[PDB]
Scaffold this active site. Structure first.
Site, PDB file in Angstrom:
ATOM      1  N   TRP A 112      -0.753   8.040   1.895  1.00 19.25           N
ATOM      2  CA  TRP A 112      -0.778   7.120   0.759  1.00 19.25           C
ATOM      3  C   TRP A 112      -0.888   5.669   1.234  1.00 19.25           C
ATOM      4  O   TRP A 112      -0.637   5.371   2.406  1.00 19.25           O
ATOM      5  CB  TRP A 112       0.490   7.311  -0.085  1.00 19.25           C
ATOM      6  CG  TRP A 112       0.333   6.942  -1.519  1.00 19.25           C
ATOM      7  CD1 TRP A 112       0.759   5.796  -2.120  1.00 19.25           C
ATOM      8  CD2 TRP A 112      -0.296   7.724  -2.541  1.00 19.25           C
ATOM      9  NE1 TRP A 112       0.435   5.811  -3.452  1.00 19.25           N
ATOM     10  CE2 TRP A 112      -0.209   6.986  -3.742  1.00 19.25           C
ATOM     11  CE3 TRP A 112      -0.923   8.979  -2.561  1.00 19.25           C
ATOM     12  CZ2 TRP A 112      -0.737   7.454  -4.953  1.00 19.25           C
ATOM     13  CZ3 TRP A 112      -1.441   9.450  -3.770  1.00 19.25           C
ATOM     14  CH2 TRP A 112      -1.343   8.686  -4.948  1.00 19.25           C
ATOM     15  N   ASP A 121      -1.890  -3.701  -2.242  1.00 19.86           N
ATOM     16  CA  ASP A 121      -1.865  -4.299  -3.587  1.00 19.86           C
ATOM     17  C   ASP A 121      -1.380  -3.298  -4.645  1.00 19.86           C
ATOM     18  O   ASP A 121      -1.132  -2.129  -4.332  1.00 19.86           O
ATOM     19  CB  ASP A 121      -3.249  -4.856  -3.962  1.00 19.86           C
ATOM     20  CG  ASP A 121      -4.307  -3.769  -4.128  1.00 19.86           C
ATOM     21  OD1 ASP A 121      -4.290  -2.790  -3.353  1.00 19.86           O
ATOM     22  OD2 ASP A 121      -5.161  -3.901  -5.031  1.00 19.86           O
ATOM     23  N   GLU A 153      -3.170   0.050  -4.934  1.00 16.57           N
ATOM     24  CA  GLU A 153      -2.917   1.026  -3.857  1.00 16.57           C
ATOM     25  C   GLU A 153      -4.134   1.254  -2.949  1.00 16.57           C
ATOM     26  O   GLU A 153      -4.366   2.371  -2.476  1.00 16.57           O
ATOM     27  CB  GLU A 153      -2.410   2.361  -4.430  1.00 16.57           C
ATOM     28  CG  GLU A 153      -1.433   2.218  -5.585  1.00 16.57           C
ATOM     29  CD  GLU A 153      -0.629   3.474  -5.828  1.00 16.57           C
ATOM     30  OE1 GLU A 153      -0.954   4.217  -6.775  1.00 16.57           O
ATOM     31  OE2 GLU A 153       0.326   3.725  -5.067  1.00 16.57           O
ATOM     32  N   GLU A 154      -4.881   0.182  -2.686  1.00 17.35           N
ATOM     33  CA  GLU A 154      -6.181   0.262  -2.014  1.00 17.35           C
ATOM     34  C   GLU A 154      -6.302  -0.738  -0.866  1.00 17.35           C
ATOM     35  O   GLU A 154      -6.391  -0.342   0.297  1.00 17.35           O
ATOM     36  CB  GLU A 154      -7.297   0.021  -3.032  1.00 17.35           C
ATOM     37  CG  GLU A 154      -7.498   1.179  -4.001  1.00 17.35           C
ATOM     38  CD  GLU A 154      -8.137   0.777  -5.321  1.00 17.35           C
ATOM     39  OE1 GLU A 154      -8.179  -0.428  -5.657  1.00 17.35           O
ATOM     40  OE2 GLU A 154      -8.602   1.685  -6.035  1.00 17.35           O
ATOM     41  N   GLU A 211      -4.918   6.343 -18.847  1.00 13.51           N
ATOM     42  CA  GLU A 211      -5.027   5.240 -17.891  1.00 13.51           C
ATOM     43  C   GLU A 211      -6.242   4.379 -18.217  1.00 13.51           C
ATOM     44  O   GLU A 211      -6.119   3.168 -18.424  1.00 13.51           O
ATOM     45  CB  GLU A 211      -5.136   5.782 -16.463  1.00 13.51           C
ATOM     46  CG  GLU A 211      -5.153   4.717 -15.381  1.00 13.51           C
ATOM     47  CD  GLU A 211      -5.205   5.313 -13.993  1.00 13.51           C
ATOM     48  OE1 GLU A 211      -4.269   5.064 -13.205  1.00 13.51           O
ATOM     49  OE2 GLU A 211      -6.181   6.032 -13.695  1.00 13.51           O
TER      50      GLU A 211
END
Ligand SMILES: *[C@@H]1O[C@H](CO)[C@@H](O[C@@H]2O[C@H](CO)[C@@H](O[C@@H]3O[C@H](CO)[C@@H](O)[C@H](O[C@H]4O[C@H](CO[C@H]5O[C@H](CO)[C@@H](O)[C@H](O)[C@@H]5O)[C@@H](O)[C@H](O)[C@@H]4O)[C@@H]3O)[C@H](O)[C@H]2NC(C)=O)[C@H](O)[C@H]1NC(C)=O
Ligand SMILES: C[C@H]1O[C@H](O[C@H]2[C@H](O)[C@@H](O)[C@@H](O[C@H]3[C@H](O)[C@@H](O)[C@@H](O)O[C@@H]3CO)O[C@@H]2CO)[C@H](O)[C@@H](O)[C@@H]1N[C@H]1C=C(CO)[C@@H](O)[C@H](O)[C@H]1O
Ligand SMILES: *[C@@H]1O[C@H](CO)[C@@H](O[C@@H]2O[C@H](CO)[C@@H](O)[C@H](O)[C@H]2NC(C)=O)[C@H](O)[C@H]1NC(C)=O
Ligand SMILES: *[C@@H]1O[C@H](CO)[C@@H](O[C@@H]2O[C@H](CO)[C@@H](O)[C@H](O)[C@H]2NC(C)=O)[C@H](O)[C@H]1NC(C)=O
Ligand SMILES: *[C@@H]1O[C@H](CO)[C@@H](O[C@@H]2O[C@H](CO)[C@@H](O)[C@H](O)[C@H]2NC(C)=O)[C@H](O)[C@H]1NC(C)=O
Ligand SMILES: *[C@@H]1O[C@H](CO)[C@@H](O[C@@H]2O[C@H](CO)[C@@H](O)[C@H](O)[C@H]2NC(C)=O)[C@H](O)[C@H]1NC(C)=O
Ligand code: NAG
Ligand code: NAG
Length: 586
Positions: free
Chosen positions: A120, A176, A179-180, A403
């Site tokens: 992750w 960030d 999540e990238e 989402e």
């Protein structure tokens, strides 16, 4: 008007969010105690996990909703205080809790609060801020409403660790909010600025020393680097081939919202000039990107996504960002009315010329009704309504906020019933009315130094204890089951070793084994011992005896090293190596 059909969706959004939160959550079967699931969609995308960002951001809404009207939300708030109190101690792939307090940055856990072992984007460094901001907004109500004890004794030691994290690790990079990008993010920095400034004020009134609150000026100093001429670059300190235009920017402003502040402030409020000029170019790029925004005018809101280079499930507009884009305007419209002034800067003039054609570089003051200041104010709030208008179109009839809603066709997709998107709708709907949270203390925030300095004071991390009750003796203890063949009585033997958890060679504090599965066929005693990982523990079994007879040790000392943190639950297999002495008869 639309006011009716968003008031109804707000009520749906409350349940939509509350159903995703355990233990008594209709949407999520399994795992409770105050851990908020992002979305019940176990089917791809598998969002059946608790994100410390989503948990802390959606509960900030729940606390702020609790402050005005609803009192039944207290139950789910106080379980969350227990939940995150425990979650702190959980050793995870980012790190352990005790030695340096590294494990707090891990963004994602199981719906339990057991570690998520899979790969992750970690660490994320913003969860601690949002979790501090959540608990600080609840605890500062408790001191105001005659329950000071709870704020000081139980809630604070949770906060103390989370802003110790920010103090120690703000100036080191992370992932960030998306999540990238492994970089210094604007949303992460702006929210973790607030956690020190607001956290310092609560530390003062509780009468305790916030370790980590020192860095508030230096965090604010670094926040000035994100601005870039025309717009604000969301992720600084890397090259990832992105523009910098990002919903990150809007989400930072709305989540760091103050009403007592003025647009002059260097905390970068929604009404601040640079933030308005970003909102222009940010929303104009999405106005041109997506097919949904086919020829929508410059003075009307549009479908907002996260960034121009987004590829996640099509690269679509998000429900939470599009509502937050409206909330951004509803925050700015309130701040101008609150401080009774609009110093329309030439850096932010491109924003206003869309909404009100005949603006200039004036100081518009709070005068008559139908005066120019009020006309700009009534036009901006009308501009805010068009953002929730286009939201209402692509929101389905039953109100199930996902989402994302699709780039081209506008139909919903991705994780169904996202808790954030429900919370983001509620946060928006609060700001439509006069329901603003509180001054977190932006006016009392220490301004940035003359020159910025790379710094971080090392905070300390004690367990919450009073809130949730782990109380950790040491970092990441791994389980290990002692089994021993020892011929004796079928029920009613100890084990000692050089480790402290076992005994340290004494029989008073020796661990007793249970004869649960003792039989004629297999005379097994056993005991599952949680003891520290990475230690060559030298152990030995020992027999306690009846009628005040002395203890009987084995002839040899055994040694087997317990494995390192993060799994490998070993079970030993020994036999009794010594004389079983005389039994009792008394
Ligand atoms: C820990 O904290 C310290 C400070 O307390 C941080 O150190 C600071 O880091 C800043 C960001 O890297 C850095 O800012 C830049 O500094 C250079 C000179 O060293 C300037 O030339 C830059 O200004 C220019 O660029 C900006 C933005 O335009 C575009 O170009 C930059 C690359 O040059 C891109 O990053 C950006 O995306 C844009 O596309 C313009 O607005 C300006 O007009 C100008 O042309 C930056 O200001 C600070 O100098 C630096 N300060 C010190 C004292 O070291 C440290 O980064 C931080 N670390 C973490 C991980 O948080
Ligand atoms: C949910 C999350 O999904 C996307 O990112 C994650 C990927 O799904 C995973 O595949 C994983 O990627 C790792 C690779 O498997 C591994 O081979 C290695 O290369 O490292 C990769 C990560 O660096 O993990 C990804 C996250 O790091 C997607 O990009 C991301 O935006 C999605 N996050 C959203 C979901 C929630 C739900 O609460 C929000 O918290 C976030 O703000 C959203 O952005
Ligand atoms: C206060 O919060 C409660 C949840 O604790 C809300 O209760 C729900 O209300 C809706 C109204 O449409 C019902 O359909 C649900 O069945 C209720 N659920 C539960 C568990 O009680 C309540 O609506 C909230 N009220 C306000 C004014 O915000
Ligand atoms: C409420 O509306 C949502 C719209 O998303 C419905 O979700 C869809 O459910 C069907 C069930 O067959 C799925 O095939 C779709 O893929 C779902 N939508 C998305 C975007 O994935 C939800 O079922 C509706 N609930 C009702 C009518 O009770
Ligand atoms: C958490 O556990 C530790 C031991 O692992 C406890 O530490 C003891 O604290 C008392 C004072 O409260 C001291 O007199 C002892 O010397 C400490 N050490 C040991 C080894 O006993 C600690 O008190 C526990 N905290 C709670 C709240 O139960
Ligand atoms: C402790 O006793 C058990 C009794 O079962 C021993 O385990 C058996 O060992 C024999 C070796 O001939 C195997 O054939 C059996 O399949 C094993 N059974 C089980 C249930 O494991 C074990 O080896 C003994 N351990 C020591 C250290 O003496
Ligand atoms: C236990 O004994 C081993 C023997 O190799 C030693 O390395 C280890 O440090 C000891 N642990 C103690 C005394 O806690
Ligand atoms: C071995 O066990 C005996 C038990 O009496 C103890 O006195 C001794 O210190 C132990 N030695 C080692 C090296 O573990």
């Amino acid at each position: 008007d639309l006011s009716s059909f968003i008031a109804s969706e707000r009520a749906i959004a409350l349940q939509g969010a509350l159903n995703n939160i355990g233990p008594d959550g209709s949407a999520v079967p399994g795992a409770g105690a105050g851990f908020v699931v992002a979305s019940p969609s176990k089917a791809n995308p598998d969002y059946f996990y608790t994100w410390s960002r989503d948990s802390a951001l959606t509960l900030k809404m729940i606390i702020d909703e609790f402050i005005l009207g609803n009192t039944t939300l207290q139950t789910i708030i106080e379980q969350y205080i227990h939940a995150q109190a425990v979650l702190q101690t959980v050793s995870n792939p980012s790190g352990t809790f005790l030695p340096d307090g590294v494990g707090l940055g891990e963004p994602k856990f199981m719906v339990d609060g057991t570690r998520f072992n899979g790969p992750w984007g970690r660490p994320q460094r913003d969860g601690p801020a949002l979790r501090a901001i959540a608990l600080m907004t609840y605890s500062n109500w408790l001191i105001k409403n005659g329950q000071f004890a709870e704020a000081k004794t139980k809630i604070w030691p949770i906060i103390a660790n989370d802003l110790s994290y920010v103090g120690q690790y703000w100036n080191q990079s992370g992932f960030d909010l998306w999540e990238e990008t492994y970089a210094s993010s604007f949303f992460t920095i702006q929210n973790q600025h607030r956690a020190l400034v607001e956290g310092a004020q609560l530390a003062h009134d509780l009468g305790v020393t916030c370790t980590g609150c020192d860095q508030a000026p230096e965090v604010l100093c670094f926040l000035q680097s994100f601005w870039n001429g025309k717009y604000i670059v969301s992720n600084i300190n890397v090259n990832n081939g992105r523009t910098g235009l990002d919903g990150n920017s809007i989400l930072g402003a709305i989540s760091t919202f103050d009403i007592d502040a003025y647009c002059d402030s260097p905390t970068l409020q929604p009404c601040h000039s640079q933030s308005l000029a970003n909102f222009k170019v940010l929303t104009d790029t999405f106005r041109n990107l997506y097919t949904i925004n086919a020829g929508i005018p410059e003075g009307q809101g549009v479908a907002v996504g996260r960034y121009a280079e987004d590829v996640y499930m099509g690269g679509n507009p998000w429900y939470l960002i599009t509502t937050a884009a409206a909330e951004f305007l509803y925050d700015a419209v309130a701040q101008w009315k609150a401080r009774h002034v609009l110093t329309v800067d030439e850096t932010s003039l491109a924003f206003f010329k869309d909404i009100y054609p005949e603006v200039t570089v004036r100081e518009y003051k709070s005068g008559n009704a139908n005066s120019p200041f009020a006309q700009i104010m009534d036009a901006v709030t009308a501009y805010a309504d068009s953002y929730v208008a286009i939201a209402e179109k692509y929101i389905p009839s039953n109100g199930s906020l996902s989402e994302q809603f699709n780039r081209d066709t506008g139909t919903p997709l991705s994780a169904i019933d996202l808790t954030w998107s429900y919370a983001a709708f509620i946060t928006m709907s609060q700001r439509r009315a006069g329901q603003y949270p509180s001054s977190w203390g932006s006016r009392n925030a220490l301004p940035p130094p003359t020159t910025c300095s790379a710094s971080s004071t090392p905070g300390i991390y004690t367990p919450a204890t009073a809130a949730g009750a782990p109380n950790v003796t040491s970092s990441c203890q791994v389980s290990i089951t002692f089994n021993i063949n020892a011929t004796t009585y079928y029920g009613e033997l100890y084990v000692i070793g050089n480790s402290s958890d076992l005994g340290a060679w004494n029989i008073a504090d020796a661990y007793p084994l249970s004869a649960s599965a003792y039989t004629q066929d297999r005379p097994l005693w056993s005991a599952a011992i949680p003891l520290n990982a990475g230690e060559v523990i030298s152990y030995q079994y020992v027999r306690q005896e009846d009628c005040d007879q002395p203890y009987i040790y084995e002839t040899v000392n055994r040694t087997l090293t317990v494995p390192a943190c993060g799994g490998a639950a070993v079970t030993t297999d020994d036999a009794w190596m010594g004389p079983v002495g005389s039994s009792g008869n008394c």
